[PDB]
Structure 1
Amino acid sequence: GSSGSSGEKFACDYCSFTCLSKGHLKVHIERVHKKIK
């Protein structure tokens, strides 16, 4: 089997990142592609 998959997971709009939680996607965008101010 493959080392990664799309499955039923959420994906980043800016890079090749994926996660099972929408909260983890929000935290990824808010810290990696945007910042807290």
Structure 2
Amino acid sequence: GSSGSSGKPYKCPQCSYASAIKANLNVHLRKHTGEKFACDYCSFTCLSKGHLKVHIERVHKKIKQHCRFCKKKYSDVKNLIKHIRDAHDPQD
């Protein structure tokens, strides 16, 4: 085999786990982490829901949007909903 000798230097700070590879320690620590809260507007993720609120309140507040029925542009997603409820209503 082309692999190196035994010893498992890369060790977990939280449990008895060890490996010979840094990527195996990185992947293992993902079990010990907190909850991932994802953004509703981008691929962003956070371990703190209060920082995720600030991310949306700064990055995705008064965000440009378009209608899925008439392709009209809108200045806020909340303004687009009122347009869909008036012009494209679900009969419910």
What TM-score comes out, normalization by structure 2 length?
Answer: 0.29
Gaps of at least 5 residues in structure 2 are 8-34, 63-92
Unaligned runs of 5+ in 1: none
Change (3 A) 1:24 1:34: same
**Are the structure 2 counterparts of residues 23 and 13 from structure 1 closer, same or farther at C-alpha, using a change threshold of 3 Å?**
same
Aligned equivalents of 2:46 and 2:53: distance in 1? 10
Query: What fraction of aligned residue pairs are identical, expressed as a percent?
Result: 100
Runs of 4 or more above 6 Å deviation: 1-7
Cα offsets for 1:1-37 (capped at 9, x unmatched): 99999992100000000000010110000000006xx
Q: 1:30 to 1:9 in 2, by over 3 A?
A: same
